[PDB]
């Protein structure tokens, strides 16, 4: 993707975010996206090519790999990143929509650009959208973290998997490619995801005290 | 890319904005960044229990006449085409709310998208006999002797992405149908 | 970035039908070739399987039945078809130093439409003659040296290649009709 | 890319616009879009009827000292160099599109250099590959291959088609370049 | 690209100009265009003298828990964030050089970079018992019978780039430490 | 897009000879390495063939005769040579916060002197490491675990030799150009 357009999309969501929202944005891009693109994706390049099974049965390797890896880790991370970034994209354009009409209403200027560049305030219709966007981000993050644990019975990848699905005779020993490196990147992705959950929850505390304690 | 998105985003109703984000963020991105690499080794890792030369080539062709990603890519182009035609036709009248002559073009564009979305979903169901991929396919086409056993690559991952594409495509049908109600009811009442 | 600028220049300086022709050329001819068709032909020779033990038999049999790839033939056709349209813009800018069709622009525009029809018809004719039809076969019988007698060879993804061949041929036939009507519209104005 | 093409396009004569079209649309695009991946498996699919280790390596090297696409890449870089450097030299002298004063010498030399570069590479293509037609079979007897070994080329017919197209297109550029030489020499002699 | 570097270039001290040059023109440039292709066949060309299935997989994983390029990519990302961390706090004050909170963040960012650079250097030494790659690795992990002999791909080229990265990273430590001494002289030693 | 901006900045701040040197580096050193030479070395180890049955003999043999790839050595040389040119712009911008005079005279002279050393050092490394500028078809190998001496064959030795000669010759031109600039500065300083 074009680096110039990468600035445009990153720049647009940067201005239309709260003080904490900029910290969450940095962690999302520098850590979640950059690691997945420049480091993690090449690790899973030979996941099935270097999957070795001690057998002479045709088709045994195909079914055993599919049984133990129903969906790849990188594919799961890619889906989670899209699901998490989408609510932030919608709430960012809503802020620009309200900022544009307020400037348009004044004309139809110098003061309105001062307050908009000062800080991003959540009030009115923005309160419902921004709160819901945070709520969906926490749910999406927890759901994918739960899926990772249930599907792969932990965050540690094993060197050897025992497979007994048809057409493999009895139980067949199979060996995973780069289990240690995949474990290291799985832990890094999980830990950073937990940090993103804490930032979203902390932001929710700021909004709640502004309304609940305000009354 | 931002210029193309900006043009379509400017000229749309409230439902149209929701239809755009579902089209761009979901159908295009997961196909580009997630789904396409799943189908990379579809024929390379297609394994058949046989010694007959050429048996693997004809069995893969029989069971996968067109790849899932190729069908999705064709469908995405067809669905997005009427939206681009509206922008081109709108600019034609500008240099030379929806009402007037634009009302018929906008209504027809939604009607075409529903037909294209449903037609491709029908092709997916008929061609592959459901949305779940099997681990084993039994093939008996020439020159394979009798019936041979062949095994698909990543059947479970492909099923997961197939369900995701079908479900999101079904949501787009409902959104387009809903927009067809806000136009027919308003005009006829 | 760069793609938008090139498309905008051609789109702005176009007639009524010519803009309909432009969207067919880009959205269908180019996108199908780029995002779908090119990866279909990726393993055309790697997965070409011949039932023989003769060294070098596979190389000659593939060459005999595929003198040029379908995707390379389509790439050549697209460049040849798009060239007259771009030649009009550069010559028009040259005349600026020196869209209604009047003056010396009439001869260049009419010739550009005329040339595009010939290029589309020529490439369509080449496709039919060279591959004896628009449908790919699963099996090809090859008896070129050094293959002993006649050997059996099997094509990779014949069905998908047939589907994309039909799509490219049918869409190119639409472009031929669109250019004919544009030529007819110009002929009506001058004949009357 | 658009700015680079736009700058050269603006600072050119009438024929120079035509020559720019032939170089970019046909020579560069077809080399990048179509020709480059035709030669992708030139050595991977080079098959020799032998059991001698290392025989395939020396036979391919003997018959293909440099790839056609690599030779065409050097032509495109060398041919386009006088056009770009003439713009820098024009800009340098201007700040310190007819011809006047020193621009006549720089422009005429650039056209002359392009013709020499065009003909030299075409001569290399003919001499090195003894014609523009690629053969299916090559007979190789270099060490360590025992006696004569039969080897088979990958996609000889498709490579022949693109070789003919590149030679013919580059030949057109020679005719267009010498036309500018006649368009300039006739004016100098008349004056 | 240019604007990203332009912003950091205009927001750094005198030594910070040199530090940014070492980070981008050397660490990133070598990794992207020179080093990443050296490690492309790290496991494909890993050869083990054995007939045991699965022995090659476990032996490569044991001796290369994480690739050098992956470790360098993580180090580059971690080292570059404290610079952006101080950039966001600077922008935070703009919505309302060393002064007040800035001195307590710029100094902290420098301290973090030194720790991150030393931590990754320490990890590189301990994990790979030195900065020199060996041609032969002896592996006795299950299921390999007894001890098997395995051979690394391009050990010498990987050693050359490892020395380049380690030495350049060590220079960044000295520059950060030297700049930290400048700040401490002005503030603490100036009391 | 970004490449034009970087080239434009360096071009706008350079001497008359320095603009020629920039052209030789970008047109010949970078472009040929990127679009032509890089893929020539693509199968350098995959197509390296050794006449042996000893496991691991091929790995240690390729490493012995190619400690670093030619393209990797060229890539390092390009980065090292271009660094002083970009360092001048970075230092100039900081000082601001084409005539050569003042303290900038020392920086410009040092940058040219550093470039001459860098090209000379890399040219010396190329000659010593590969005992010449011509690649051999056959390399003899007696490193462990290869038994006795084994025969190994290099991939595309002739094409690599052609590009090696071209890069060395162009590097020598840049050395002469930089030395010429050193003469036009000492004459304007010592004689004047
Ligand atoms: C954040 C980084 C988290 C790293 C967690 C590492 C957990 C796995 C582990 O114990 O790794 C050991 C070596 O670690 C390593 O090689 C990685 C250590 C950290 C490297 C730098 C990360 C940035 C291997 O120990 P083991 O024998 O359990 O190996 C497992 C084979 N099944
Ligand atoms: C959108 C979410 C779609 C989830 C359902 C898709 C998969 C349905 C089939 C299924 O249950 O698969 C079994 C386990 O799958 C799984 O465990 C797939 C779970 C996917 C997690 C959600 C990802 C987001 C494998 O069983 P099988 O062998 O029948 O698989 C079929 C191939 N043979
Ligand atoms: C777009 C053009 C689609 C119509 C032409 C399709 C011709 C091929 C065709 O009918 O193939 C059948 C299945 O294809 C299909 O089912 C193709 C469906 C295309 C869906 C729209 C895209 C099986 O034809 P066959 O098994 O005899 O194939 C003989 C080749 N080897
Ligand atoms: C100028 C651009 C067009 C050049 C076309 C002719 C070039 C190749 C000459 C040989 C020829 O006619 O090829 C026959 C099929 O033609 C083809 O495949 C020519 C297709 C050209 C389509 C338009 C582009 C194969 O016949 P052969 O076996 O004698 O080929 C000998 C090579 N091996
Ligand atoms: C910073 C510059 C780093 C240069 C030194 C790194 C290599 C040190 C080891 C060494 O002398 O390598 C021997 C020859 O290498 C060489 O001759 C490498 C020369 C590199 C030229 C400088 C490139 C810049 C091979 O000997 P070995 O077998 O011990 O190699 C190790 C694998 N086993
Ligand atoms: C700068 C250009 C440098 C050209 C000469 C360098 C290569 C020297 C070897 C040489 O002359 O190769 C010949 C082929 O020429 C070629 O391949 C010359 C191609 C020149 C193209 C334009 C640049 C045949 O040399 P041989 O068959 O005796 O080689 C056996 C040893 N490998």
Topology:
The structure is cut from a larger assembly and holds 6 copies of chain A.
Chain A: H1 3-15, H2 19-43, E1 52-53, H3 60-68, H4 73-107, H5 110-118, H6 125-151, E2 160-163, E3 172-175, H7 179-211
Antiparallel strand pairs in A: 1-3, 2-3
Bound molecules: phosphatidylethanolamine (6 copies).
Pfam families (chain A): Connexin
Membrane topology (chain A): Multi-pass membrane protein
GO molecular function (chain A): calcium ion binding; gap junction channel activity; gap junction channel activity involved in cell communication by electrical coupling; identical protein binding
Written overview of the protein:
The structure is cut from a larger assembly and holds six copies of chain A. The N and C termini of chain A lie far apart (47 Å). Chain A has a three-stranded antiparallel sheet with strand order 1-3-2, covered by helices on one side. Chain A contains seven helices and three strands. The first copy, chain A, is elongated. In chain A, helix 2 runs antiparallel to helix 4, helix 2 packs antiparallel against helix 7 and helix 4 runs antiparallel to helix 6. With 215 residues, chain A is mainly alpha-helical. At the A-E interface, helix 1, helix 2, strand 1, strand 3 and helix 7 of A face helix 3 and helix 4 of E. The complex binds phosphatidylethanolamine (6 copies). It is classed as membrane protein. Keywords: Gap junction Large Pore Channel Carbon dioxide sensitive, membrane protein. Cryo-EM structure of Cx26 solubilised in LMNG: classification on subunit A; Nconst-mon conformation.
């Amino acid at each position: 993707m074009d680096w110039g357009t990468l600035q445009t999309i990153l720049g647009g969501v940067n201005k239309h975010s709260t003080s904490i929202g900029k910290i969450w944005l940095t962690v999302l891009f520098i850590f979640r996206i950059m690691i997945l693109v420049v480091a993690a994706k090449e690790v899973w390049g030979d996941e099935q090519a270097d999957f070795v099974c001690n057998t002479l049965q045709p088709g045994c390797k195909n079914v055993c790999y599919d049984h133990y890896f129903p969906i790849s880790h990188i594919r799961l991370w890619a889906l989670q990143l899209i699901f998490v970034s989408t609510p932030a994209l919608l709430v960012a354009m809503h802020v620009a929509y309200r900022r544009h009409e307020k400037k348009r209403k004044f004309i139809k200027f110098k003061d309105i650009e001062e307050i908009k560049t000062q800080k991003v305030r959540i009030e009115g219709s923005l309160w419902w959208t921004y709160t819901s966007s945070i709520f969906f981000r926490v749910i999406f993050e927890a759901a994918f973290m739960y899926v990772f644990y249930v599907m792969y019975d932990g965050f540690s990848m094993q060197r050897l998997v025992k497979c007994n699905a048809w057409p493999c005779p009895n139980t067949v020993d199979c060996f995973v490619s780069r289990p240690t490196e995949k474990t290291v990147f799985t832990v890094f992705m999980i830990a950073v995801s937990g940090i993103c959950i804490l930032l979203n929850v902390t932001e929710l505390c700021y909004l709640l005290i502004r309304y609940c304690s305000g009354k």
